[PDB]
Subunit: 281 residues, 2 copies
């Protein structure tokens, strides 16, 4: 009979609500408040510090686009790193690539992983894959200490207010750059084009200081504020990430629900007002 | 201090809210409840029967895509009809085309037009243009009686529950077909791909019974349910509406905020799950 409502100073004057069928789990971890409920129409929902992280109904949009964009552009990715993303959605999509031989994930809050393993089985199933290696720690420290370099890095970031506050600066992007192969790619969750173009501009500024090609793409997802979210795309080659190099025809990919070859590049076709805001950058 | 919340049986278990800065006007017209408020962050907002029709912050997305898609594909449109759309957003975009010589609009609720003329001046300004002719009546009757035929028809429809219930059937689309030139185009507001694919499927079914090319496109707009809304595109030629035939370089179009040449076709690149749902149709 009651409703969950998502408020935040990051999007003042607006809110999105889901009808709660039953509350499944709540706790205060070392790092944040965790809530899991079954919604009446979006299936199960994960909330962190009062911010919706995912729902069963639409998470495939975010996880597919964040993963298959960089992974269909990298020629033969062997070693992939996911920053954040304790829920495992990125990992699930990554395991689909039989040519990947190692997936490292760095998540600061193991509670997120554990909760996901219990309540979101079709999302966290990737954890059962032998290539997957979990590191419970601060992304900044992980990046400073790792000896390996990666073909792809996916910053499945979480909002700038909270634990992911540190994932939104100039020091962080150089660490990413150094952790990548010379032909390596990073994609990062970047805020909605409707809410904070100031943030998007800033992220693109930091990124261009290092990467030779920085592009921005948009994903339609109803349970993120304003119904969409961006992908900050960083490339070491000047070819960038707008055009896939391969088609996903293997039986592993026959279940995809959002991503395909055409909408990969389409996602980079932005509203006129945004294109205008993003140069002289 | 208080909030407007958009509930509906058309999207159960979800709701979108805007913080109200001040309520500007309310009435019960012959046809529906009308509310106009100044929101704290989306500017002024028009509500009909508790459903958000537009806000100043983002209406340009819907009005630009609905208008400039069909109008950049029609070779030399002279006579255009807008069904519904008493707010005048479509009309504003249409007047930008100096080659148009007549714009007919059929709106059943003159209160909508009057309210818009008073509270939404930068949206309803098109009404001051001499080519514009207003008809206060039922779209079905208007379409049955009009002697002229149109190059383009834009069904700026309103949701299936209420006055626009009649704009969602098989009789209505034949009337549209007969009212169009042999090479004429219709575009119609069609529901969100996240909420009702059943409706979208039905609309496409009705349309293909008459039109030789029926395509579907998506618009990102945060203040419609799920943050996007579709355009049902109907063509009499098999060439369809995905590719513009002209660029909007005239000084009339230099102010566009969403539409451009590339995102015209991009908008037709749909999520894999939808493409799959829409055939065997």
């Amino acid at each position: 009979k009651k409703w969950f409502s998502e408020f935040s100073i990051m999007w003042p004057g607006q809110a999105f609500s889901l009808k709660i069928k039953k509350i499944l789990y709540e706790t205060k971890s070392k790092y944040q408040n965790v809530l899991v409920f079954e919604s009446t129409t979006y299936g199960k929902v994960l909330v962190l510090d009062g911010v919706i992280q995912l729902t069963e109904k639409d998470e495939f949009a975010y996880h597919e686009m964040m993963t298959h964009v960089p992974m269909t552009v990298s020629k033969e990715p062997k070693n992939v790193l996911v920053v954040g993303g304790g829920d495992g959605g990125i990992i699930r999509e990554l395991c689909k690539y039989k040519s990947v031989e190692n997936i490292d994930i760095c998540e600061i809050d193991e509670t997120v992983i554990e909760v996901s393993k219990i309540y979101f089985k079709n999302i966290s199933c990737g954890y059962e894959d032998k290539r997957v290696n979990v590191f419970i720690e601060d992304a900044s420290k992980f990046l400073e200490n790792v000896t390996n370099t990666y073909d792809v890095i996916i910053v499945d970031s979480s909002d700038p207010i909270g634990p992911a506050e540190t994932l939104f600066n100039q020091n962080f992007y150089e660490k990413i750059y150094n952790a990548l192969k010379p032909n390596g790619y990073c994609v990062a969750q970047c805020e909605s084009l409707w809410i904070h173009v100031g943030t998007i501009k800033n992220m693109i500024g930091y990124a261009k200081k290092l990467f030779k090609k920085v592009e921005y793409a948009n994903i339609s997802i109803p349970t993120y504020p304003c119904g969409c979210i961006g992908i900050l795309c960083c490339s070491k080659t000047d070819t960038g990430l707008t055009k896939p190099n391969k088609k996903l025809e293997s039986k592993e990919f026959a279940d995809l629900k959002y991503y395909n070859y055409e909408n990969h590049s389409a996602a980079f076709k932005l509203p006129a007002f945004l294109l205008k805001e993003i140069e002289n950058i």
